[PDB]
Amino acid sequence: INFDTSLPTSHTYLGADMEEFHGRTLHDDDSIQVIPVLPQVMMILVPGQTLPLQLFHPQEVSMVRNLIQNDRTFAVLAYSNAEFGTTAEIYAYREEQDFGIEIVKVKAIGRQRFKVLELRTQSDGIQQAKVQILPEGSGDAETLMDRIKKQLREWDEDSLPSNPIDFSYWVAANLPIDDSLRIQLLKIDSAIQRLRCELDIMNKCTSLCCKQCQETEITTKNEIFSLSREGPMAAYVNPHGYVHEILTVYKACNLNLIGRPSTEHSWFPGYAWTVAQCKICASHIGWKFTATKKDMSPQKFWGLTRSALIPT
Ligand SMILES: N#Cc1ccc(N2CCN(Cc3ccc(COc4cccc5c4CN([C@H]4CCC(=O)NC4=O)C5=O)cc3)CC2)c(F)c1
Ligand SMILES: [Zn+2]
């Protein structure tokens, strides 16, 4: 590729002038902490994963302002339909105004996992969560990490973590799997146990389908390509604050193209998106990205929403 695999990770569609916070905050294990809960996101965050956010409502804008004064850390719960979650630490901040509307744009990172002990909704409607920090641990597993990396090569072609705990959350966050399996991987405390399950999951992986119809195969594990350092799967925020997880793939099937290619708010700079819908149900599965210059090495790719896809 000729693209910069570090620009998808900068989220420059959010504005190119953000504050940076370098400090870190790691709570101790078994510790019990009260943290604000992100109000609209319904995702399963993995430690290491990056969360882009676009906040408009006064209640949400004031919260994030109190987080910057305090820990800059909040809670993202894993919903079975919320007994576990992950913490997210803001590392970049930017305040905007549009027609007298205060917009906040934040970039956050998954940090530590937790088990919800108690929940509270407050006067502003923003929920708060009393969580016990779950532990990670020690140990090594090089045989496993190498067998998992052998399989990932038979799928696509040191962009991969070298630490068992870090590698385990990279597969957790980048494998094409159901949210029921992401939770299972998040309920484990040892990395060795997680890398094992993750190797089974991918040996039993299948094509991905349209979730609305369960009748069209859109793509497979062997078409996944990484155009970003983060990985083949990355979260992005649309113009209305809706965060999507996107699988980047070279070929997608059973999709129709609606509209003319556009560059506005593109998550992949230099490219242009066109809505792709299922050929049978017409449900929005994602977008087809196309290059604005003939010199760009990946001239076309697909970005598919993990929300519109179900494993076969
Ligand atoms: N309170 C308050 C408040 C809140 C929000 C305000 N405004 C929001 C809109 N902004 C102007 C605008 C208009 C129209 C468009 C067309 O594009 C759209 C439209 C709808 C959904 C999606 C996309 C693109 N897209 C993906 C495709 C893949 C990719 O690469 N990137 C993406 O984003 C989507 O999912 C873009 C920007 C101006 C600000 C505000 F003015 C006040
Ligand atoms: Zn369909």
UniProtKB/Swiss-Prot annotation:
Known tissue expression: Widely expressed. Highly expressed in brain.
Domain Lon N-terminal as annotated: residue spans: 35-206
SMART domains noted in UniProt: LON
Matches recorded under Pfam families: LON_substr_bdg (PF02190), Yippee-Mis18 (PF03226)
Chain positions recorded as Zn(2+) binding sites: 210, 213, 278, 281
Disulphide bond pairs: none
GO cellular component entries: Cul4A-RING E3 ubiquitin ligase complex; cytoplasm; cytosol; membrane; nucleus; perinuclear region of cytoplasm
PANTHER family associated with the record: CEREBLON (PTHR14255), PROTEIN CEREBLON (PTHR14255:SF4)
Subunit structure: Interacts with KCNT1. Component of a DCX (DDB1-CUL4-X-box) protein ligase complex, at least composed of CRBN, CUL4A, DDB1 and RBX1. Interacts directly with DDB1. Interacts (in pomalidomide-bound form) with IKZF1 and IKZF3. Interacts with ILF2. Interacts with TRAF6 and ECSIT.
Function of the protein: Substrate recognition component of a DCX (DDB1-CUL4-X-box) E3 protein ligase complex that mediates the ubiquitination and subsequent proteasomal degradation of target proteins, such as MEIS2, ILF2 or GLUL. Normal degradation of key regulatory proteins is required for normal limb outgrowth and expression of the fibroblast growth factor FGF8. Maintains presynaptic glutamate release and consequently cognitive functions, such as memory and learning, by negatively regulating large-conductance calcium-activated potassium (BK) channels in excitatory neurons.
Disease listed for this protein: Intellectual developmental disorder, autosomal recessive 2: A disorder characterized by significantly below average general intellectual functioning associated with impairments in adaptive behavior and manifested during the developmental period. MRT2 patients display mild intellectual disability with a standard IQ ranged from 50 to 70. IQ scores are lower in males than females. Developmental milestones are mildly delayed. There are no dysmorphic or autistic features.
Stated name of the protein: Protein cereblon
Source organism of this protein record: Homo sapiens
Gene: CRBN
